[PDB]
């Protein structure tokens, strides 16, 4: 089978607040700058994806410019990195340089924010959704005794409840920075604890930190990859109201969720 | 043999019932970078079929056999009597209902030759309690008006809700709420593509996470939602095992 080997695959890469990878005004030349700008057609929010672990946009490889922390992201002349072995780009969405360990990140969520390589930290603002579907995908989250996360309170917590058909506060927009939010207000977020004596989980203003990266794994958890823990509701009882951030278990089924989109 | 009986029934049951099939179709499964279990290839004939029991509330039994390669029925036994779909492995005959009355439905186990025979599609198939029950009869009797229609509720309620989360979520709300579906585009979109799916995923280990072709997944509101990579919560949060395509 030939398709097991496809040579080649153009897509979009979209992140932080759902905006796209960009190469600042389509310029051609070594060192030309990829930032943070609102999703389009045009050809250098193209990327197409290689075999040989490069990552394309006007016929150039997408690169970090420093082995150090802190620099740009850049596309350059791929015959520079035929001898390089380029990027993975891990389960949860972090784009990672191979012999660097630097991820592509955005510092800022304002569009023509320049991209950068960074030190992996597991933020919001590390994640990354490679595809052309850029769009925030509007789902439900079905948890513990088949009942629905509501964000609750004018939008500070979040609780399970009994699932009601187009019940506002139950939809929640999934964006292509792992950021899990509230459908009638995107600018929130849900987030871990920022307070150190809680692990209770609340809706906050979006920011792109640790807190409110949230990656919903094939064994149906969802996981912050930063904190090394899962979304687990409070004893494994709805009544409680709380849904908190623990480490993964088998015990009880609190940790596992269902996306009914 | 793993079961699902009415008298034991409830979401909860169900939930179970699903997680266990899961679990043993996918013992022995290899796993990629997505972390999606692959089903077994190439397997022994001997030991290519997980037997399956399901009992309506009038208490009438049927064992259905699952080819653990794809996830599909080859055939089913009730009594003494068994019933093959032509398509299922020609020595399937010499391993499985041996000591019954074997006979050969005139049809293929695929959606598409059981609506063509049975003269209606999946979204004219209402779906839940009900239905199951009246699927069991059918079969049990296998009653020939009813094959088909019973087999297109018991290959969603039971192997495509294995294979997908979010059909899983569809039976569980139907059992909940004591109320039937017919699945609409997001329910057949995600059966259509099991097959494309696991081969595009697997591709994927090639390019980064990203599918060689797109998969156009349909929402409960009708949009399309294309699919050509593994960052998708759709996908990866929701297919719970693959058909085996890629080494
Ligand atoms: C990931 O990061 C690593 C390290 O930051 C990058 O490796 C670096 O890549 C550049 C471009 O190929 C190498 O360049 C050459 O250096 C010589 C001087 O030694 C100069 O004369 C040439 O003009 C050219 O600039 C650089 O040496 C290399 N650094 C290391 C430590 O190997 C890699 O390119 C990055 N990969 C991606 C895809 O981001
Ligand atoms: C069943 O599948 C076989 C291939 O295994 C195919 O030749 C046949 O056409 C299918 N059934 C029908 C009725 O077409
Ligand atoms: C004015 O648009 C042009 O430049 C901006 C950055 O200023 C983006 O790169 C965009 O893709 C490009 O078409």
Redesign the pocket.
């Given at each position: 089978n030939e398709q097991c080997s496809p040579q080649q695959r153009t897509t979009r890469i979209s992140g932080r607040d759902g905006l796209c990878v960009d190469v600042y005004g389509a310029l051609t030349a070594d060192g030309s700058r990829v930032i943070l700008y609102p999703c389009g057609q045009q050809q250098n929010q193209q990327w197409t994806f290689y075999p040989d672990?490069?990552?394309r946009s006007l016929g150039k490889?997408?690169?970090?410019?420093?082995?150090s922390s802190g620099s740009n992201?850049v596309i350059?002349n791929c015959d520079?990195?035929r001898?390089?072995?380029?990027?993975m780009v891990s389960s949860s969405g972090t784009m990672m340089?191979?012999?660097?360990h630097?991820v592509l990140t955005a510092n800022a969520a304002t569009s023509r924010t320049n991209l950068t390589?960074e030190n992996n930290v597991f933020a919001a603002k590390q994640a990354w959704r490679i595809g052309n579907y850029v769009e925030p995908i509007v789902t439900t989250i079905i948890g513990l005794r088949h009942m629905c996360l509501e964000a609750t309170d004018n939008d500070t917590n979040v609780w399970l409840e009994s699932c009601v058909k187009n019940k506002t506060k139950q939809y929640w927009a999934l964006y292509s920075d792992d950021t899990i939010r509230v459908n009638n207000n995107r600018n929130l977020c849900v987030s871990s604890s920022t307070d150190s004596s809680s692990k209770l989980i609340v809706i906050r203003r979006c920011d792109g930190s640790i807190n409110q990266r949230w990656v919903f794994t094939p064994q149906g958890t969802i996981s912050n990859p930063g904190y090394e823990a899962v979304m687990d509701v409070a004893q494994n009882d709805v009544y409680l109201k709380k849904i908190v951030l623990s480490s993964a278990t088998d015990k009880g089924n609190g940790q596992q969720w269902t996306v009914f989109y | 043999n793993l079961s699902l009986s009415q008298s034991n029934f409830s979401a909860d049951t169900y939930k179970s019932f699903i997680k266990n099939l899961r679990k043993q179709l996918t013992i022995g499964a290899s796993y990629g970078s997505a972390g999606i279990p692959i089903l077994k290839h190439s397997v022994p004939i001997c030991e290519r079929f997980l037997l399956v029991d399901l009992t309506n509330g009038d208490n009438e039994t049927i064992t259905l056999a699952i080819n653990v390669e794809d996830a599909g029925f080859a055939a089913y036994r009730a009594a003494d009597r068994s019933y093959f779909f032509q398509n299922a492995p020609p020595i399937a005959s010499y391993v499985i209902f041996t000591d019954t009355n074997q006979n050969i439905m005139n049809f293929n186990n695929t959606f598409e030759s059981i609506e063509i025979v049975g003269g209606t599609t999946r979204s004219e198939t209402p779906l839940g309690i009900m239905h199951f029950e009246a699927s069991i009869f059918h079969l049990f009797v296998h009653d020939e008006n009813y094959v088909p229609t019973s087999f297109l509720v018991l290959i969603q309620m039971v192997l495509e809700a294995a294979k997908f989360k979010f059909i899983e979520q569809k039976v569980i709300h139907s059992i909940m709420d004591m109320e039937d579906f017919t699945p609409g585009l997001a329910m057949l979109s995600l059966e259509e593509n099991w097959t494309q799916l696991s081969l595009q995923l697997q591709a994927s280990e090639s390019l980064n996470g990203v599918f060689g072709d797109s998969v156009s997944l349909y929402n409960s509101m009708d949009e399309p939602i294309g699919v050509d990579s593994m960052y998708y919560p759709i996908l990866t949060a929701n297919m719970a095992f693959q058909l085996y395509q890629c080494p």
């Open positions: 672990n490069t990552i490889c997408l690169a970090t410019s420093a082995l992201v350059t520079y990195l001898y390089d072995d380029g990027w340089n191979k012999s660097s630097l390589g | -």
